[PDB]
Amino acid sequence: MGSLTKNDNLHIFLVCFIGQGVVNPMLRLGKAFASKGLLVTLSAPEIVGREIRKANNLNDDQSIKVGNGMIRFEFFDDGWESVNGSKPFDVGVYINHLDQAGRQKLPIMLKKHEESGTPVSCLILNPLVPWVADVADSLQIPCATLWVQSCASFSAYYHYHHGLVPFPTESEPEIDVQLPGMPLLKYDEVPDYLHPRTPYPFFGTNILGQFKNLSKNFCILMDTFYELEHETIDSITKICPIKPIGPLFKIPKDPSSNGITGNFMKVDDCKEWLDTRPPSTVVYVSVGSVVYLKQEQVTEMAYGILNSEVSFLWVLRPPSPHVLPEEFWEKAGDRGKVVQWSPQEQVLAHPATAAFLTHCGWNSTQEAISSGVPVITFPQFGDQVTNAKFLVEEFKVGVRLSRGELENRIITRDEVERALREITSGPKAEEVKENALKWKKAAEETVAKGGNSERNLVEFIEEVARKTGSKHES
Amino acid sequence: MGSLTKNDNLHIFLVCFIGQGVVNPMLRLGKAFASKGLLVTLSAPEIVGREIRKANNLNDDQSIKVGNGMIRFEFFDDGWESVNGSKPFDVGVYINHLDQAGRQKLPIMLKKHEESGTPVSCLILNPLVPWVADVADSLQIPCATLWVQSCASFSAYYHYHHGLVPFPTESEPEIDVQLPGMPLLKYDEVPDYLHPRTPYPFFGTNILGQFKNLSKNFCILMDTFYELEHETIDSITKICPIKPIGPLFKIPKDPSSNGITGNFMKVDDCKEWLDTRPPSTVVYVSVGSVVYLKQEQVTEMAYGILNSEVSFLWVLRPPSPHVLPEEFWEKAGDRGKVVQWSPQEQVLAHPATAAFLTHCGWNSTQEAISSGVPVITFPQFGDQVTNAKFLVEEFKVGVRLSRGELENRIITRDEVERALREITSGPKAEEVKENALKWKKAAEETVAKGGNSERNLVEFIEEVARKTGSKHES
Numbered sequence A, B: 001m002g003s004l005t006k007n008d009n010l011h012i013f014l015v016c017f018i019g020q021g022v023v024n025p026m027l028r029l030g031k032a033f034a035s036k037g038l039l040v041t042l043s044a045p046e047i048v049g050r051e052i053r054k055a056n057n058l059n060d061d062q063s064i065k066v067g068n069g070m071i072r073f074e075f076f077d078d079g080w081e082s083v084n085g086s087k088p089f090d091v092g093v094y095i096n097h098l099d100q101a102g103r104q105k106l107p108i109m110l111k112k113h114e115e116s117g118t119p120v121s122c123l124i125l126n127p128l129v130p131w132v133a134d135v136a137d138s139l140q141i142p143c144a145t146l147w148v149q150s151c152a153s154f155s156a157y158y159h160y161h162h163g164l165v166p167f168p169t170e171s172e173p174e175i176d177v178q179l180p181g182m183p184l185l186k187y188d189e190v191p192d193y194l195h196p197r198t199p200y201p202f203f204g205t206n207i208l209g210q211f212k213n214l215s216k217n218f219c220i221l222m223d224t225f226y227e228l229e230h231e232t233i234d235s236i237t238k239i240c241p242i243k244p245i246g247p248l249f250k251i252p253k254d255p256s257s258n259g260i261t262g263n264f265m266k267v268d269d270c271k272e273w274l275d276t277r278p279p280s281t282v283v284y285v286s287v288g289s290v291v292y293l294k295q296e297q298v299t300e301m302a303y304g305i306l307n308s309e310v311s312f313l314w315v316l317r318p319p320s321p322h323v324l325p326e327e328f329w330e331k332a333g334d335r336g337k338v339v340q341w342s343p344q345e346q347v348l349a350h351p352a353t354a355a356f357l358t359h360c361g362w363n364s365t366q367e368a369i370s371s372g373v374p375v376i377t378f379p380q381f382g383d384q385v386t387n388a389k390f391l392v393e394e395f396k397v398g399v400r401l402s403r404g405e406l407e408n409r410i411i412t413r414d415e416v417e418r419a420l421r422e423i424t425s426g427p428k429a430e431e432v433k434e435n436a437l438k439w440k441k442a443a444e445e446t447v448a449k450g451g452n453s454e455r456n457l458v459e460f461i462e463e464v465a466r467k468t469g470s471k472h473e474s
């Protein structure tokens, strides 16, 4: 191999987009790198940097030490407030703006790190900023992308963008889709951003932008694990350099980096009330922050919860409706608790928790899998309808409530009551609970030393080290 | 009459509920009283007082001088944050809480004003705090209520609560309702909070609480004017002591009190862009802050606006979606402006404004009438469907777009385009514009010296003065 003529650290430079859905997985990846001694720069537009500085207490240089590793923050000015003015935020307009502004700002940052003696070893982007890979390719800087949805969802978008398999069109809106290494998907089980009936076609186009220059990333980091989607991963690896490294939230947390958070919203305290509950009795209900439920759907949920008589912890976050029935609060004093934002990981790990009524976002899908908590699937849009199909039919840890908002119907209180009673007692409840405990074990092993996800991460670091030549001068 | 043996001022004590929809009309009434030399106390729960102190710059005693009159603020602790805790806000829960807390706090405030030499002469409440009239009656303190919807809407709720006329029920959901002095209302033209199909039955119950003890108010102040609803007012006055004093926003504003505002949201600047527009060309589009439009409806609005080719000023306020088509912004550079919160009164008074696409809330309905601006009716829920029927069929200043969200259908872009083109040219556009200019004149006269609304206000002040005996000691 040759005698050592240099002993440089590596410098990982992550580039975020907007919102907690990108910052948190990106920040979790950066904390893993910093615990292994690498210098990590979390970079983001200034509109994100305002929320990061407000949520945390960053010092004058905005950096924390983790051994010889480090997590530092470098926010760049996207010029958005000056250009956008009084207009309401439009993510379709913004993503194009960040493309132009990012291509101007990133080379300046990278050139400065080169002059300052801290050259960037690897850029890591996400699907909504694929221009990072263009700048990386032009500078001969290795780059990788962090896919934060399931591998099933990746395979759907890949085959759609490349036209490798017939998808539902306006002429045939209801044909099934058979993807390699996947179960057969119904027309409404494909990530419905890609379906012609979607009200959000722009969300699909934005995700599809990752695939136009995907081959510029030498590695596709995935927030999933091999045991969970082994058949889909086997089929995709033959085409793309994907490497499952998830669940990102289950990687061992280093205490010297646990002070940093990517969550921007206040967290209500659920631990105190959960501790008073008998084990495996509370049904945790949450649709996240992006889902906005109509009043009529909330009412049927309240009556279903009330008629089911189950104990519950309901995350009912309003915008800036929603009134619950009066009879609900008469009985809620003994049975349930209603909050606006819960500590979901802590809640799913509590011994009082029995099930998770969820909208089936991929983070929640993985957190339920990793916690051994069975689910009631209540998908709304996007890849949720896909995650819901896997939770119930493939992972076999779930009970179905709805098929997504494109079904265009209110889920009645009788449907809510039946699903709640089914996940809490009877033969189906025992089956999905047992399967969920086998997924909890598999998730805890893949991130442990020697696990599939842990090995792929160290392999990525070593591959970066080889490309950088961190121990051989030139 | 007798020799004068005292020379006291009056003390008007207004009690608000929550939100700008109550604070602003209440504050406008208080400013009118203070310009006529009366001491005015604007009272509200502390959760409102936080927004009032943040929006304004109140001194240590929180009072402004207007001649010998005065506007002062006295916020009381409703104990809500301690009781509610981590629960999301529920107006159904809150209104009952404010009932219990209000009945405890108001007598303490009133008793203190009595001991401090500033006894309250008249209490003025609103329909969502009718317990004020109970406390006023027990203390022999005159009280009046401020009805902030149309007289047509009052007559609907009055006859419903008293069962004087058959309304739509679950058995007969589609029968018409004939109210005295009113045009025939279709089943979906009754304020739909009262219809069995409403998703918000609690909003109707809350308003109906005003009528259970309405007869304790010696006067019912109305934010309408006689010329506008003369036939309905004639029929109601025979039963109830109503006195139209509106439009409240068109009462002459005193400069020494114009610094106080009841609006809590930031105001984008539209005057600069409107000044560059040729006269009577811009279609102002706004659904207020309470209406939350789905993405699919926003898309059709954008394409209708774009295909209509009209100039526009669109108030598109998102919660804390909503993405507009890319083709929209290519053409919006020359034709339109999109903001999050506009100065609506200033916008409706600008000579460039041509029409108002509105959700037909009563404040917006009156502001369009008072400004001489024709409307496209786009009602959502509540009394809006009633205001929309009057705007188009009775006031004859409007063009109909939809019949409310209970119709349960997306208004297509072709319907948006047809309505936009109809209000901006052709014979209907000339007719509704001419009628709107006749309502502008009638509105400006009723608030001027000698007008119907102005006389009813001075008559109310004199009646308070007689009950108080402000010039004769005992």
Ligand SMILES: O=c1ccn([C@@H]2O[C@H](COP(=O)(O)OP(=O)(O)O)[C@@H](O)[C@H]2O)c(=O)[nH]1
Pocket: A021, A286, A288, A289, A290, A291, A315, A340, A341, A342, A343, A344, A345, A360, A361, A362, A363, A364, A365, A367
């Ligand atoms: O009350 C809540 C709801 C959600 N979450 C977290 O927020 C993220 C949302 O995940 P998901 O991908 O399902 O939501 P989406 O992308 O659909 O908004 C997850 O990490 C959850 O654990 C949380 O901490 N508290």
Ligand SMILES: O=c1ccn([C@@H]2O[C@H](COP(=O)(O)OP(=O)(O)O)[C@@H](O)[C@H]2O)c(=O)[nH]1
Pocket: B021, B286, B288, B289, B290, B291, B315, B340, B341, B342, B343, B344, B345, B360, B361, B362, B363, B364, B365, B367
């Ligand atoms: O962009 C906007 C929208 C509304 N308004 C004002 O807010 C009030 C809302 O009136 P309305 O009763 O129609 O609304 P709602 O009660 O339905 O929310 C009116 O005084 C409007 O002039 C405003 O100043 N700017």
